[PDB]
Amino acid sequence: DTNIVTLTRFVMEQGRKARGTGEMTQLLNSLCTAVKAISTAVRKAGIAKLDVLSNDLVINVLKSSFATCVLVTEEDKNAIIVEPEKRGKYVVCFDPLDGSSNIDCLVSIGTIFGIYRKNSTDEPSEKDALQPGRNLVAAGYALYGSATMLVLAMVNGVNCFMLDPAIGEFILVDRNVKIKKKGSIYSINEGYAKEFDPAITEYIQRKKFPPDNSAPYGARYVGSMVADVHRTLVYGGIFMYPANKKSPKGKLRLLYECNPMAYVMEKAGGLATTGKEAVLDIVPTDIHQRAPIILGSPEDVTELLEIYQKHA
Amino acid sequence: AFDTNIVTLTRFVMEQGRKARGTGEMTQLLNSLCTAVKAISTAVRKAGIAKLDVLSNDLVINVLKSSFATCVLVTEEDKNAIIVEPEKRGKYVVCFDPLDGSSNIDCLVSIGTIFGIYRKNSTDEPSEKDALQPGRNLVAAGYALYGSATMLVLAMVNGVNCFMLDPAIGEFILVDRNVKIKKKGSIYSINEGYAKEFDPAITEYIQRKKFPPDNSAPYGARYVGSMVADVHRTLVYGGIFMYPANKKSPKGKLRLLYECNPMAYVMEKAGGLATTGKEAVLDIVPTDIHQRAPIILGSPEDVTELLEIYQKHA
Amino acid sequence: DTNIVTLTRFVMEQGRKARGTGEMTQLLNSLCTAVKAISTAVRKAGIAKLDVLSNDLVINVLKSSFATCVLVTEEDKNAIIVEPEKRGKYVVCFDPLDGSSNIDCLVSIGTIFGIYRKNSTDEPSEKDALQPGRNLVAAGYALYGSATMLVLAMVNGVNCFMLDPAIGEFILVDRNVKIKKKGSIYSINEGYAKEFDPAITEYIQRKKFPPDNSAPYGARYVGSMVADVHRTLVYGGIFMYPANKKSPKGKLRLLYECNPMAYVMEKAGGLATTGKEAVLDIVPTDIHQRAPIILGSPEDVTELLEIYQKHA
Amino acid sequence: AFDTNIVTLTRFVMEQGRKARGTGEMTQLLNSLCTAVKAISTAVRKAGIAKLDVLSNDLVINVLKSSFATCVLVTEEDKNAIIVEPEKRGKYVVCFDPLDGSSNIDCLVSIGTIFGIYRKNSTDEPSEKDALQPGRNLVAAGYALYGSATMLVLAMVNGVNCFMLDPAIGEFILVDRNVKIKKKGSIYSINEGYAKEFDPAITEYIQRKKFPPDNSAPYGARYVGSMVADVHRTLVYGGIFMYPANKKSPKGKLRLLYECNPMAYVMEKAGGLATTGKEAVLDIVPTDIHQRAPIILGSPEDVTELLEIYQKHA
Ligand SMILES: O=P(O)(O)OC[C@@H]1O[C@H](COP(=O)(O)O)[C@@H](O)[C@@H]1O
Ligand SMILES: O=P(O)(O)OC[C@@H]1O[C@H](COP(=O)(O)O)[C@@H](O)[C@@H]1O
Ligand SMILES: O=P(O)(O)OC[C@@H]1O[C@H](COP(=O)(O)O)[C@@H](O)[C@@H]1O
Ligand SMILES: O=P(O)(O)OC[C@@H]1O[C@H](COP(=O)(O)O)[C@@H](O)[C@@H]1O
Ligand SMILES: [Mg+2]
Ligand SMILES: [Mg+2]
Ligand SMILES: [Mg+2]
Ligand SMILES: [Mg+2]
């Protein structure tokens, strides 16, 4: 296409409307180099650990962007502070490859990222990262499956870009993704059925055997959060990884799995809660803390929230 | 970097047929299918920037006819069997589903091409009767998975070998030789949204997986919603995949000739079982080319565990 | 490679040292999208004019960069003035695909570009483009052959970047290309032998039948300027498209063939002359004017210049 | 977009051999060479980010042996002919230059793989004598050009057909069928740096091209410096390519079996001539596998014009 709207062109025209300095546009450009290199890695991870390579890649592209200052990783015990010479205004919380272990089974996987603005005047620190997802200025994920898709939520909307592997560019294919109000699928690991707390268990039963003599929901569960959430966004439904006695505080980490997705969901008109509060309004105390998460089409998450407080 | 001794699928099937006194035909047929799979991998990968199953159908059909190795072809997109024109005939029957789950591309779930090849057992004019052979008589069967990578998994008389598309040279490269499934698995795959209508055998097996009597950890649940996806997962990691019958689909959903039987043959050659609940899928005699069948496949002990539950429920 | 120096990372670190605004870095990034799309086009221009597509591509990526204001093309009669809303500080003179007609024969071909800074305060105009190549702030070419190579000359040096088609990125492979002083090849279309002016003709004879009983020069001539010049830069030699009675003012255009190459050559320690003056010191009056050009390793161009004024 | 009726090289050679009662061998051999060409195209394209001719040699040799279609192989990188082991033998002789002009990669000039395939004419044990056949006895011959695109040009008994690598599906696609060269050309290709030592026949032809007696426009000069480059140019656009002898290379530079003869056979099947100046290259009897020969090929009238100059100079 002769005037292809690339992710660069898209982000660039939006930063220009803020009368900014281009650090966002630098950032997402670097992150895109990481994403292409990792898609290429996963498309041949078989012909002859991987998440370590993936991680050193994302840190390097992000430091060299001259746009970050604190970086928090799935893979790193502490926050990494960008050297003064390369420091810039943003904080990035990211998981470089959620569920790497799934590549043997060829399950679609992805990089999840969340970006905050450091607001304080003192030295870069983990505190800058300990912010509520409600204050993210941008977020999204790149999914490596049949095709590589980068979905990006900013103040203006949720947009989806596809990698064109010929020209090595992410091209804009869906503008202002809005989720369906009510959907027909429920995504959850039912093999934890005995560990679930009452509200979930009533809702599972309500969807399988619908009290209103309507259609039972379809069950789906890829087993990798990006695959499941992306399907929930494009098709509608509910996705849950609730607390259970094995994972009492949930399992997905708040700063780099839950808050990114929750932000993408809510920006598309979806909702995202823990059962007791909005995921995005949780204030983190540890950069690696977990959350219960339930997200998806609005009426569905709500139906569940009623069962939660018709049980409180 | 740049390997000199590359084992491509063509080189490996060639080293099979040659020692068994091949004719050059299996390889002609298979190299044709590989072009079709490459061509479908790419369009799927650019799907959203560019029906795809109709085009796939036409493609798979044209590359197959041109192999000079086919005579009858069955497709899920074609009512009647296609009999290849005389000039291009050869001895095999290829039953195939060109693009499994094509509904799911929008949500970027891995989908696949499934195929079964029979050898014609008659001195006659090709007709769809030649396709109506049971699973046990398959010469080769396999699938192509369009996922984070493109995997072709061929199962033929000695075993199952996985291949992966090297997108640089455009070749399927041998990555796993002589595969064998785990014996006992830890994953069960079934659409529990249909839970209100399952037969009581299934209903107990699922609850046994969830709430184990003998205080084991429950089995995990996984269900991508694309048969190829869930089968490959079942083959590499083990477990059990169940698409049993429910009254709303009274004799199952999955079609016997080009979906159930290819998977059943790939499973059994890896040491798994594939049954409908009553009999081995591979011994059902096909009566209509688009006939349907319930299928349960997976790790031998898990299949068997569900069978004992079926036996005590009859 | 986990910390790949991409053309973006290279240009970005250099603009940062000027305390600039990033328009250069925007520019070369957009130009790179054009170059990848055209390499992809040429790598299948056969499976089933092209230079028209190539041109609309380069103009579009360049306007959307918010970094240009006058664009001069091989293919356009007049200079194109960037709309106010997308205007920026640079001028780009470019040939989107020198020798397109050579793709039938599979001769390596390329995009040549030259960038000036508009220095005046008045409205953008062709005058801003009518500058001497000596004042280019950057220049180079992308070559589409066996591999796609972008060679870029800036105030700091000549560097060569190769496109890695897996990750869709130009990677830095040669830093500070310096040309050889004296080389062993002479590149010229000898089928014009009767049309050549005396100095050339003495020099051709001196290289074939060397008076010092030394080795005769090897002749080479691909027939596409980028192929020939790139070889001259990497291997050393002399390349000439002199004036001849068919082409009395030369044939290559000054603003988008000769001045870019001349600038790349001189920045690598090469020289580039018309026989009477340095190509880069010529002051253009028409944006589509031609020049005689003779460029290559220094001692060789000089040897020829002595024959020119041992004939003046 | 996404074509359903893709004519790949495998499909086209298959439609040749089948009507002529093939054995499945030419196609086995050729599909092997295509993998080698794909693998060499990519490494060349990433050459500067990554000897390449040694690896190419090994690659071409392993893919060829595995075709079950070869018995003797001659390479410019190997002194003696390689005789394929018994298990993998078949009827053909492939003489090949794995990476012509590999010196030139640094300067990013298009280079190529050249190959000739003979059919063994003896009931004997394979030996390099089987390779010492003259050009006229070639069954198929061609080249692969690694340029702005990857072009494979196969010449076989009926004509020459160009194919182009579609980097998406990784297949060589038929783009020009039944090629024929122009009869009179306008380009002569020769390294005039060697001008001090050419034989007087050449010296007049070049001056006739430059300074035409009959007041035509002079011929243009073009010389890439890679034989494949200049040959393909000569085939598609016409003209004459001359690598004659000079005393400093007294019997020419280009080796007869795997460079001169493949080009000579591709030229003649397109209606061009290839001579040394005295005789047609295709009738010289090879005596050493690495023997050399002068070659002049190109458009029939231009070749002939230089020959009349050779006849009146003897
Ligand atoms: O191992 P990661 O990188 O944390 O990702 C795995 C995650 O963990 C979930 C699977 O957990 P269960 O098997 O407990 O459902 C996936 O859906 C998520 O991607
Ligand atoms: O209809 P298709 O193209 O066969 O794809 C969907 C199929 O239907 C199954 C899932 O259906 P449910 O939603 O009934 O589980 C998949 O395993 C199969 O691929
Ligand atoms: O047609 P373009 O795009 O101007 O490019 C052709 C140029 O013209 C030269 C060829 O001219 P001659 O055949 O006169 O040497 C090439 O070297 C140059 O690339
Ligand atoms: O030595 P190679 O690998 O055969 O490559 C260079 C060869 O040598 C010829 C050019 O040599 P000159 O410099 O003598 O013209 C080319 O046509 C041939 O490819
Ligand atoms: Mg994770
Ligand atoms: Mg199907
Ligand atoms: Mg030009
Ligand atoms: Mg050679």
XYZ file of N, CA and C in Angstrom, chain C residues 131-298:
504
model
N 20.850 24.853 -4.266
C 22.028 25.029 -3.438
C 23.195 24.193 -3.954
N 24.448 24.391 -3.550
C 25.584 23.610 -4.006
C 25.673 22.382 -3.156
N 26.010 21.256 -3.767
C 26.171 20.025 -3.041
C 27.102 20.154 -1.868
N 28.002 21.134 -1.848
C 28.909 21.294 -0.734
C 28.164 21.590 0.558
N 26.948 22.160 0.468
C 26.148 22.448 1.659
C 25.104 21.356 1.952
N 25.249 20.088 1.533
C 24.289 19.036 1.857
C 24.535 18.704 3.310
N 23.530 18.406 4.128
C 23.857 18.063 5.508
C 23.952 16.534 5.612
N 23.436 15.810 4.608
C 23.443 14.372 4.593
C 23.173 13.888 3.194
N 23.579 12.670 2.845
C 23.311 12.114 1.518
C 23.682 10.643 1.425
N 23.258 9.962 0.369
C 23.588 8.568 0.246
C 22.647 7.909 -0.707
N 22.680 6.607 -0.732
C 21.864 5.838 -1.634
C 21.484 4.521 -0.991
N 20.433 3.876 -1.471
C 20.050 2.548 -1.033
C 20.232 1.751 -2.303
N 20.833 0.580 -2.271
C 21.097 -0.231 -3.449
C 20.301 -1.497 -3.231
N 19.624 -1.917 -4.292
C 18.825 -3.129 -4.328
C 19.526 -4.105 -5.248
N 20.240 -5.043 -4.645
C 20.922 -6.096 -5.367
C 20.763 -7.344 -4.531
N 21.828 -8.139 -4.501
C 21.959 -9.400 -3.776
C 21.445 -9.261 -2.371
N 21.688 -8.066 -1.829
C 21.292 -7.630 -0.505
C 20.927 -6.162 -0.665
N 20.182 -5.595 0.256
C 19.828 -4.205 0.173
C 20.734 -3.455 1.147
N 21.433 -2.465 0.626
C 22.411 -1.715 1.390
C 22.038 -0.248 1.337
N 22.022 0.408 2.482
C 21.828 1.842 2.582
C 23.183 2.372 3.016
N 23.746 3.299 2.258
C 25.039 3.907 2.538
C 24.682 5.365 2.742
N 25.193 5.873 3.850
C 24.807 7.168 4.335
C 26.034 7.907 4.726
N 26.142 9.091 4.169
C 27.206 10.031 4.447
C 26.619 11.137 5.286
N 27.173 11.517 6.418
C 26.695 12.699 7.129
C 27.902 13.569 7.459
N 27.833 14.618 8.301
C 29.037 15.422 8.576
C 30.138 14.550 9.179
N 29.733 13.528 9.916
C 30.640 12.609 10.590
C 31.267 11.454 9.814
N 30.957 11.164 8.554
C 31.555 9.995 7.942
C 30.616 9.360 6.945
N 31.053 8.235 6.405
C 30.267 7.461 5.490
C 30.110 6.180 6.269
N 28.870 5.699 6.347
C 28.579 4.441 7.003
C 27.679 3.611 6.102
N 27.772 2.300 6.264
C 26.997 1.378 5.460
C 26.171 0.499 6.384
N 24.901 0.435 6.036
C 23.919 -0.337 6.762
C 23.286 -1.318 5.789
N 23.100 -2.557 6.250
C 22.462 -3.612 5.487
C 21.052 -3.947 5.991
N 20.083 -4.153 5.130
C 18.774 -4.513 5.596
C 18.724 -5.957 6.036
N 18.312 -6.230 7.271
C 18.113 -7.575 7.723
C 16.651 -7.885 7.453
N 16.267 -8.663 6.442
C 14.871 -8.821 6.024
C 13.995 -9.620 6.972
N 14.621 -10.276 7.941
C 13.912 -11.005 8.964
C 13.248 -9.974 9.877
N 14.090 -9.167 10.526
C 13.585 -8.176 11.453
C 13.173 -6.897 10.757
N 13.260 -6.740 9.435
C 12.891 -5.492 8.779
C 13.608 -4.260 9.353
N 14.934 -4.301 9.504
C 15.716 -3.185 10.043
C 17.035 -3.029 9.305
N 17.534 -1.824 9.101
C 18.825 -1.643 8.509
C 19.813 -1.703 9.641
N 20.779 -2.627 9.574
C 21.792 -2.821 10.591
C 23.140 -2.265 10.143
N 23.894 -1.599 11.059
C 25.199 -1.012 10.786
C 26.259 -2.068 10.706
N 26.829 -2.121 9.479
C 27.878 -3.076 9.139
C 29.193 -2.425 8.753
N 29.343 -1.241 8.155
C 30.684 -0.670 7.960
C 30.788 0.754 8.480
N 31.666 1.066 9.451
C 31.779 2.411 10.022
C 32.978 3.132 9.422
N 32.769 4.371 8.953
C 33.814 5.226 8.424
C 34.515 4.635 7.240
N 33.711 4.372 6.233
C 34.283 3.854 5.013
C 35.235 4.918 4.464
N 36.477 4.531 4.244
C 37.436 5.399 3.594
C 37.760 4.657 2.304
N 37.922 5.382 1.193
C 38.245 4.758 -0.076
C 39.770 4.573 -0.158
N 40.155 3.618 -0.988
C 41.541 3.391 -1.318
C 42.029 4.553 -2.155
N 43.291 4.917 -1.927
C 43.940 5.996 -2.634
C 44.028 5.788 -4.131
N 44.551 4.646 -4.539
C 44.702 4.286 -5.941
C 44.018 2.923 -6.036
N 43.307 2.651 -7.130
C 42.589 1.407 -7.301
C 42.944 0.833 -8.653
N 42.353 -0.283 -9.034
C 42.769 -0.995 -10.232
C 41.718 -1.103 -11.329
N 40.585 -0.416 -11.248
C 39.496 -0.579 -12.189
C 39.094 0.772 -12.753
N 38.601 0.809 -13.974
C 38.115 2.027 -14.546
C 36.729 1.669 -15.055
N 35.747 2.461 -14.710
C 34.405 2.170 -15.123
C 33.950 3.216 -16.131
N 33.578 2.867 -17.374
C 33.097 3.822 -18.364
C 32.443 3.104 -19.536
N 31.430 3.703 -20.175
C 30.746 3.083 -21.307
C 31.588 3.288 -22.554
N 32.485 2.344 -22.867
C 33.389 2.539 -23.999
C 32.734 2.564 -25.354
N 31.462 2.154 -25.448
C 30.699 2.214 -26.683
C 30.461 3.658 -27.109
N 30.875 4.623 -26.300
C 30.828 6.011 -26.695
C 32.217 6.443 -27.129
N 33.157 5.522 -27.366
C 34.547 5.850 -27.633
C 34.791 6.932 -28.650
N 33.966 7.010 -29.690
C 34.205 8.049 -30.662
C 33.730 9.410 -30.218
N 32.807 9.455 -29.267
C 32.273 10.713 -28.808
C 33.151 11.316 -27.718
N 34.105 10.630 -27.096
C 34.857 11.204 -25.991
C 35.819 12.332 -26.290
N 35.907 13.305 -25.393
C 36.837 14.411 -25.552
C 38.271 13.983 -25.204
N 39.329 14.503 -25.857
C 40.720 14.109 -25.680
C 41.270 13.631 -24.353
N 40.977 14.284 -23.227
C 41.608 13.864 -21.994
C 41.232 12.474 -21.516
N 39.952 12.133 -21.726
C 39.414 10.847 -21.329
C 40.171 9.829 -22.160
N 40.020 9.944 -23.473
C 40.673 9.097 -24.461
C 42.167 8.916 -24.213
N 42.958 9.894 -23.759
C 44.351 9.606 -23.430
C 44.363 8.686 -22.201
N 43.604 9.037 -21.148
C 43.557 8.257 -19.922
C 43.099 6.823 -20.180
N 42.100 6.520 -21.024
C 41.656 5.154 -21.310
C 42.844 4.375 -21.862
N 43.535 4.989 -22.814
C 44.692 4.384 -23.434
C 45.826 4.139 -22.422
N 46.082 5.054 -21.488
C 47.068 4.908 -20.424
C 46.785 3.759 -19.463
N 45.524 3.385 -19.287
C 45.165 2.325 -18.352
C 45.144 0.964 -19.015
N 44.767 0.917 -20.289
C 44.783 -0.319 -21.048
C 46.230 -0.643 -21.356
N 46.925 0.252 -22.045
C 48.327 0.036 -22.344
C 49.178 0.947 -21.443
N 49.509 0.543 -20.209
C 50.147 1.387 -19.216
C 51.528 1.764 -19.688
N 51.891 3.041 -19.866
C 53.246 3.490 -20.192
C 54.328 3.028 -19.205
N 54.039 2.888 -17.904
C 55.042 2.448 -16.935
C 55.234 0.918 -16.890
N 54.850 0.137 -17.927
C 54.955 -1.342 -18.040
C 54.412 -2.136 -16.832
N 53.424 -1.500 -16.200
C 52.754 -1.992 -15.009
C 51.490 -2.746 -15.401
N 50.622 -3.071 -14.445
C 49.425 -3.817 -14.767
C 48.357 -2.911 -15.382
N 47.733 -3.296 -16.511
C 46.557 -2.657 -17.086
C 45.367 -2.697 -16.145
N 44.562 -1.645 -16.133
C 43.407 -1.616 -15.268
C 42.331 -2.560 -15.728
N 41.539 -3.091 -14.805
C 40.403 -3.912 -15.166
C 39.278 -2.975 -15.556
N 38.495 -3.320 -16.564
C 37.368 -2.513 -16.986
C 36.153 -3.085 -16.273
N 35.191 -2.268 -15.829
C 33.934 -2.763 -15.276
C 32.915 -1.698 -15.632
N 31.648 -2.056 -15.855
C 30.584 -1.088 -16.117
C 29.233 -1.781 -16.012
N 28.550 -1.770 -14.864
C 27.266 -2.426 -14.709
C 26.205 -1.772 -15.580
N 26.222 -0.441 -15.672
C 25.225 0.282 -16.464
C 24.122 0.877 -15.601
N 24.386 0.956 -14.313
C 23.468 1.567 -13.397
C 24.423 2.165 -12.388
N 24.291 3.486 -12.260
C 25.157 4.329 -11.470
C 25.350 3.864 -10.051
N 24.317 3.526 -9.299
C 24.513 3.041 -7.934
C 25.421 1.802 -7.838
N 25.269 0.802 -8.727
C 26.083 -0.417 -8.736
C 27.546 -0.064 -8.958
N 27.769 0.735 -9.988
C 29.102 1.193 -10.313
C 29.761 2.057 -9.279
N 29.067 3.036 -8.703
C 29.632 3.893 -7.666
C 29.898 3.113 -6.390
N 28.969 2.244 -5.978
C 29.182 1.484 -4.760
C 30.416 0.610 -4.875
N 30.617 -0.036 -6.021
C 31.803 -0.830 -6.242
C 33.057 0.053 -6.147
N 33.080 1.210 -6.832
C 34.147 2.190 -6.743
C 34.413 2.587 -5.284
N 33.395 2.742 -4.445
C 33.624 3.125 -3.083
C 34.232 1.982 -2.343
N 33.735 0.769 -2.471
C 34.245 -0.301 -1.625
C 35.564 -0.924 -2.097
N 35.769 -0.927 -3.397
C 36.927 -1.538 -3.973
C 37.910 -0.476 -4.403
N 37.534 0.745 -4.799
C 38.506 1.718 -5.287
C 38.564 1.652 -6.809
N 38.942 2.719 -7.482
C 38.949 2.744 -8.931
C 38.497 4.115 -9.329
N 37.972 4.255 -10.526
C 37.530 5.527 -11.053
C 36.274 5.118 -11.782
N 35.310 6.007 -11.786
C 34.047 5.791 -12.435
C 33.882 7.091 -13.171
N 33.481 7.048 -14.436
C 33.257 8.231 -15.228
C 32.006 8.228 -16.111
N 31.217 9.288 -16.156
C 30.246 9.395 -17.216
C 30.603 10.809 -17.602
N 31.545 10.939 -18.527
C 31.976 12.201 -19.064
C 30.953 12.707 -20.068
N 31.184 13.969 -20.380
C 30.459 14.614 -21.452
C 30.930 13.920 -22.725
N 30.031 13.918 -23.680
C 30.298 13.334 -24.970
C 29.329 14.049 -25.909
N 29.478 14.067 -27.238
C 28.576 14.834 -28.113
C 27.104 14.447 -28.073
N 26.775 13.280 -27.515
C 25.389 12.913 -27.298
C 24.965 13.571 -25.981
N 25.841 13.631 -24.987
C 25.466 14.166 -23.701
C 26.468 15.286 -23.371
N 26.471 16.457 -24.028
C 27.473 17.500 -23.818
C 27.560 18.079 -22.407
N 26.421 18.117 -21.700
C 26.400 18.549 -20.315
C 26.410 17.364 -19.374
N 26.894 16.232 -19.853
C 26.867 15.018 -19.082
C 25.474 14.438 -19.232
N 25.126 13.513 -18.357
C 23.839 12.857 -18.428
C 23.245 12.768 -17.037
N 24.053 12.575 -15.996
C 23.482 12.394 -14.681
C 23.081 13.754 -14.169
N 21.980 13.834 -13.454
C 21.518 15.103 -12.972
C 22.257 15.501 -11.736
N 22.614 16.763 -11.713
C 23.325 17.349 -10.620
C 22.633 17.262 -9.285
N 21.372 17.655 -9.145
C 20.858 17.698 -7.783
C 20.573 16.336 -7.189
N 20.180 15.311 -7.984
C 19.875 14.019 -7.379
C 20.684 12.823 -7.797
N 21.604 12.895 -8.759
C 22.553 11.798 -8.957
C 23.949 12.246 -8.578
N 24.477 13.261 -9.268
C 25.861 13.644 -9.106
C 26.192 14.165 -7.721
N 25.589 15.264 -7.222
C 25.901 15.807 -5.900
C 25.810 14.822 -4.724
N 24.834 13.904 -4.549
C 24.824 12.814 -3.546
C 26.022 11.894 -3.572
N 26.334 11.419 -4.762
C 27.428 10.502 -4.914
C 28.718 11.245 -4.632
N 28.889 12.435 -5.204
C 30.071 13.241 -5.032
C 30.264 13.483 -3.570
N 29.186 13.781 -2.853
C 29.310 14.003 -1.427
C 29.730 12.726 -0.702
N 29.216 11.549 -1.073
C 29.561 10.313 -0.406
C 31.042 10.048 -0.655
N 31.500 10.260 -1.908
C 32.875 10.047 -2.359
C 33.847 10.912 -1.598
N 33.651 12.229 -1.635
C 34.521 13.146 -0.937
C 34.503 12.876 0.564
N 33.384 12.485 1.151
C 33.386 12.172 2.570
C 34.151 10.904 2.911
N 34.451 10.094 1.916
C 35.248 8.911 2.124
C 36.672 9.170 1.633
N 37.070 10.403 1.350
C 38.405 10.659 0.867
C 38.549 10.464 -0.632
N 37.454 10.400 -1.365
C 37.502 10.264 -2.802
C 37.451 11.642 -3.374
N 37.435 11.811 -4.678
C 37.244 13.134 -5.238
C 36.172 13.012 -6.296
N 35.568 14.133 -6.659
C 34.581 14.105 -7.700
C 34.550 15.432 -8.444
N 34.836 15.327 -9.727
C 34.969 16.472 -10.583
C 34.300 16.188 -11.904
N 34.130 17.294 -12.629
C 33.527 17.345 -13.950
C 34.598 17.410 -15.033
N 35.832 17.573 -14.563
C 36.957 17.786 -15.451
C 37.420 19.237 -15.372
N 36.520 20.171 -15.122
C 36.856 21.582 -15.002
C 36.611 22.088 -13.585
N 35.702 21.503 -12.779
C 35.465 21.926 -11.403
C 34.928 20.811 -10.524
N 34.971 20.995 -9.195
C 34.449 20.023 -8.258
C 32.958 20.021 -8.442
N 32.381 18.831 -8.464
C 30.961 18.678 -8.660
C 30.220 19.364 -7.539
N 30.658 19.130 -6.308
C 29.996 19.756 -5.189
C 30.003 21.287 -5.115
N 30.846 21.994 -5.885
C 30.978 23.454 -5.832
C 30.189 24.115 -6.952
N 29.491 23.300 -7.741
C 28.667 23.821 -8.802
C 27.411 24.335 -8.136
N 27.010 25.501 -8.603
C 25.813 26.179 -8.138
C 24.670 25.957 -9.149
N 23.587 25.240 -8.794
C 22.539 24.913 -9.736
C 21.637 26.093 -10.037
N 21.192 26.120 -11.292
C 20.272 27.130 -11.759
C 18.959 26.400 -12.071
N 19.005 25.130 -12.516
C 17.806 24.358 -12.769
C 17.897 23.108 -11.948
N 16.827 22.766 -11.254
C 16.780 21.557 -10.447
C 16.971 20.225 -11.200
N 16.916 20.244 -12.537
C 17.087 19.051 -13.352
C 18.299 19.216 -14.268
N 19.334 19.982 -13.877
C 20.489 20.138 -14.752
C 21.481 18.999 -14.593
N 22.293 18.748 -15.616
C 23.217 17.639 -15.637
C 24.612 18.139 -15.372
N 25.452 17.162 -15.133
C 26.851 17.367 -14.922
C 27.578 16.201 -15.595
N 28.748 16.498 -16.179
C 29.809 15.518 -16.345
C 30.190 15.007 -14.961
N 30.564 13.744 -14.777
C 31.052 13.311 -13.473
C 32.190 12.319 -13.695
N 33.216 12.399 -12.868
C 34.374 11.528 -12.862
C 34.590 11.423 -11.351
N 34.535 10.243 -10.697
C 34.748 10.104 -9.254
C 35.445 8.792 -8.954
N 36.031 8.631 -7.790
C 36.713 7.397 -7.508
C 37.877 7.703 -6.613
N 38.772 6.736 -6.469
C 39.974 6.880 -5.692
C 40.749 8.131 -6.094
N 41.354 8.831 -5.156
C 41.959 10.122 -5.382
C 43.042 10.169 -6.448
